[PDB]
From a paper:
The protein hnRNPA2 functions in RNA stabilization, splicing, trafficking, and translation. In its role in protecting mRNAs, it is a component of cytoplasmic stress granules, one of the so-called membraneless organelles (MLOs). Its 341 amino-acid-residue sequence contains an RNA-binding domain (RBD) with two RNA recognition motifs (RRMs) and a 161-residue C-terminal low-complexity domain (LCD). The LCD is rich in Gly, Tyr, Phe, Asn, and Asp residues, and poor in hydrophobes, with Val, Ala, Leu, and Ile entirely absent.
A missense point mutation that converts a conserved aspartic acid to a valine (D290V) in hnRNPA2-LCD was identified in 2013 as being associated with ALS and MSP2. To investigate the structural differences between the wildtype and the mutant, we crystallized the hexamer segment 286GNYNVF291 containing the disease-causing mutation and determined its structure by X-ray crystallography. As expected, the crystal structure of the mutant segment forms a steric zipper motif and the sidechains of the two β-sheets mate tightly with each other in a dry interface. The area buried (Ab) and shape complementarity (Sc) for the mutant segment are 104 Å2 per chain and 0.86, respectively. The mutant segment structure forms in-register, parallel β-sheets. The backbones of the wildtype structure and the mutant segment fit well with each other, whereas the sidechain of Asp290 in the wildtype structure clashes with Asn289 of the mating sheet of mutant steric zipper, disrupting the steric zipper formation. When the conserved Asp290 residue is mutated to a Val, the mutation enables a more stable steric zipper interaction that was previously prevented by the Asp290 sidechain. The mutant segment, as we expected, precipitated after shaking (left), and TEM images showed that the precipitates were composed of micro-crystals (left). The results suggest that the mutant segment with the pathogenic mutation forms a more stable structure than the WT segment, and converts a gel-promoting segment into an aggregation-promoting segment. Unsurprisingly, the mutant segment is an outlier in terms of having greater energetic stability than any hexameric segment in either hnRNPA2 or FUS.
Author numbering:
A (entry chain A), B (entry chain A), C (entry chain A), D (entry chain A), E (entry chain A), F (entry chain A), ...: 286 to 291
The structure:
């Protein structure tokens, strides 16, 4: 999966 | 899946 | 799935 | 599914 | 499903 | 409180 | 409170 | 509190 | 608190 | 606190 986490 | 989390 | 979470 | 959650 | 939740 | 539950 | 329940 | 639960 | 739970 | 949980 793709995770862009801030 | 795709997760863009802020 | 797609999750855009703020 | 698609989740846009604010 | 599609969930746009505010 | 605010509860949006699916 | 506010409850939106599905 | 705020609860958005899927 | 804020809870966005999937 | 803030909890975004998948």
């Amino acid at each position: 999966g793709n995770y862009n986490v801030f």
